[PDB]
Amino acid sequence: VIDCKGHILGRLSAIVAKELLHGHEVALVRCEKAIISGAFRDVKAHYLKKMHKRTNFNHLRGPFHFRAPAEIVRRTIRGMIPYKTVRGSDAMSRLRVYDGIPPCCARYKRVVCPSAMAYLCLRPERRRCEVGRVAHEIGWQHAADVERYEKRRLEECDKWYQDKIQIDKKIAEAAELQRINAELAKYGY
C-alpha cells in the first residue's frame, strides 16, 4: 500500500511495476497528491497534447485518454508492464489504484518509497505540478469531493491519534527474552 503524496509519477511507476511483475500486488492511495515533474503550464500542455492523440476513423477505437488521476498513475504503470501478454495482464489486474485513501484501504498499514519522492529527488526550485491539479484542468470534475472526504478522514484520524497513543502506551508499559536476544545477542537487530 504505497501512499503517493509527493512521489514522482514516473519513479513510483518503476518501483511498483517491478513489484507487480515480481508478483506482489499493491494498492496506491492519495494518488492526486503525486507530482509530475516540470512547470505546470508545460506539464498541462504535455497532457493536453497527449489527449489530442485519437484514431481519426473512430475515436472509439482510439487511444483512451483518462482524466481522473488514479487512472493517470495506472496508465503510466501500464507502459512499464507487458499489458498485452498474459503474465502482464495478471499484473495490471493486481494493481488497485485509489484516488484519495478510500475506506477500502484506510486501515491498511502504509509504506512510502523514500527514493522516488520528489522531496529527495527534485532540487529545490525545479517547479513541480501535482497530477491532481493537472487532472482538474484536463477534465476531472470530482476534485472537490475527494478533498472534502480526505479532510473528514484526516479529522477522524486526528481523534484516533489521541486514542491510539493510549492503547500502545499501555502495551509498552507492560514490558513484563527476544527483546534481549533477537536484537541484543551478538545480533544487534
Partner: protein, 98 residues
C-alpha cells in the same frame, strides 16, 4: 512433503536467464529477500531452494550457483526446469541444512 518445519528465508523467481533475443530456460533468476549486493550473494550461494508447483503440490527442489547481478539476484537451476506458470511465484531457500 519433506518440507513442513523448515524455517526458510523468502525468495521470488523473477525470470529465466535471458538476452533481449534468446531465453536460457536452464537457469532461473531468483531474487532472495535480504541479499542486496553481489558480495551479499555468498551467504546464499549453493544453498538448497524449493518452489511448490501450485497445481502439482510437489516441492520442486533446486540449487543456486552464481549471482546474476551486482544487485544480488542469484541464478539457480531447479531439479526439473521450472514450467513458466511459476514465473513470479515464491521459492523458499531452506535455513535447515536438511
Amino acid at each position: 512433503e519433506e518440507i513442513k518445519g523448515k524455517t526458510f528465508l523468502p525468495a521470488i523467481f523473477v525470470g529465466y536467464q535471458r538476452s533481449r533475443a534468446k531465453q536460457r530456460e536452464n537457469v532461473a533468476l531468483v531474487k532472495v529477500s535480504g541479499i542486496y549486493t553481489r558480495a551479499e550473494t555468498d551467504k546464499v550461494l549453493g544453498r538448497l531452494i524449493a518452489i511448490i508447483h501450485s497445481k502439482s503440490g510437489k516441492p520442486i527442489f533446486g540449487k543456486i550457483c552464481r549471482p546474476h547481478g551486482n544487485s544480488g539476484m542469484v541464478r539457480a537451476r531447479f531439479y526439473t526446469n521450472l514450467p513458466g506458470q511459476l514465473m513470479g511465484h515464491k521459492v523458499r531457500v531452506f535455513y535447515d541444512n536438511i
